[PDB]
Amino acid sequence: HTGYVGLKNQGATCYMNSLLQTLFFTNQLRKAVYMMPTEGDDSSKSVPLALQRVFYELQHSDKPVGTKKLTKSFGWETLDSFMQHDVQELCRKLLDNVENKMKGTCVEGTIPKLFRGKMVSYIQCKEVDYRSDRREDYYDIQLSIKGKKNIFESFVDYVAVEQLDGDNKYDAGEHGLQEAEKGVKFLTLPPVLHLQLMRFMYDPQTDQNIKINDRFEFPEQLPLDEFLQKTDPKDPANYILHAVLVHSGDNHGGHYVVYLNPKGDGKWCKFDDDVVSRCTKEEAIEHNYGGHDDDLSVRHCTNAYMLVYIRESKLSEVLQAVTDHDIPQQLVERLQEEKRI
C-alpha cells in the first residue's frame, strides 16, 4: 500500500532493520552499492554482496525481505553481537566496508562524497601568543541532548569553547605546557548528515548506563549556515529531515522503528520490521521528541536517537531515481540464479 517493503523480524537484531531502510533510501548510496564489482565475491562471506542482495530485494520484492545472509556475512549471528555494538558502529563499519569495495571502481569515493564533512579544532593559549589549528574529517555528528531544548542548542554546545588547564594543559611548543582554550568549527557539512543523539550514556551519579527520555526537539528544516567558518552564497547549508530512528523503551531494552519520507517530499512512512505504513508528519517528528508531560498517567519513553538530514541543494541527486538500468546485469543474473532453492 505504501509501495515500500519491510524487513523480516527473524531474530532479535535491535537497530539493524532501521539502519538498513535508512541506507536503502539513500538512493545515491544504493546505486553505488549496486555497482560494486562483486562478480568474484564469495556468495556467503561477502558483506558487499549481502548488502547488494538486501537492497535488490527491498527494491524488487513484494514480500518482507530476509536478512539472515546479511547477518551471516557480518558474522553477527546472535543477539549478543547486536548487544555489543550500536547503530553508529554498525553504520560506520558497513559504510567503511562498502567504501573499501568501491576503491578502484567507477564509484570510488561515493561514501566520502555523501557523508564526509570537514571540521577544524582550534587552540588558543591564554597567556602566551600561541595558537594552533587541526583539520579533521568527520562522517557523523554526536549531539549532546541532556539539558538541550533542540538541535540548535546542541550545535551551540558542540562548538562551545572548552578550557585546557590543570592536568590537561596544552603543549605549546617552545612555551611548554600552557593554559589554553579549544573549540570546534565546521568547515563543511556533507550532503547526507547523520546526527547521533546522545540518549544512551554512562551516568556517573547512579553509576550506571541509562537512557535519557527527556524532550528534545528537531525541525523538519534545519539551517546550519551560522555554524560554518565560511558559507557558500550559492549553496546554503539548509538541511531537510529524511529519517528519524526511534527507540521505545528503557534501561532494560526496547523496540526499534524508523520513520522516513523517502523522496524528501514530506510524505512520511513508518517502518516497523515487516509492517510499513503511511503516517503523518507529526507522527514522525513531534511524536518522537520525547518528554515527560503527564508521566504520572503513563510512561513516555518513545523518542529519536538518530536523525538523517539531506542538504537541500543535494536532495535531487542524493534521492535520484534508481532504475533496473542502473543495476549491472551480472548482479541481476547472480541473484535470480540463487533462488535455485
Binding site: C14, E89, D96, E136, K182, N209, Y256
Partner: protein, 76 residues
Amino acid sequence: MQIFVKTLTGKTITLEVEPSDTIENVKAKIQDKEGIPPDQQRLIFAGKQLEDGRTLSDYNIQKESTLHLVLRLRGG
C-alpha cells in the same frame, strides 16, 4: 606527542603517546588517566574506528589529533 581525547562528558583530556603505541597501549593510557577500562572504549579518529593490533602510525595520528571516545554500552 600530545594528542587529545574527547571523553564521554564531552570534555577533552590530553594524552601523551608515541607513534609506535598500539591502540591497546592508547586505551591503557586512557584508563590510566580517565579510569575507563579498555574493553569499554571505542576510539574514533577522523570518522574511522581504531582497531586493536594497529598502531597510531597506521592512522596518520599526530600531535593535537583528537580521538573521540565513545563507551561500549550493552543494548539492542
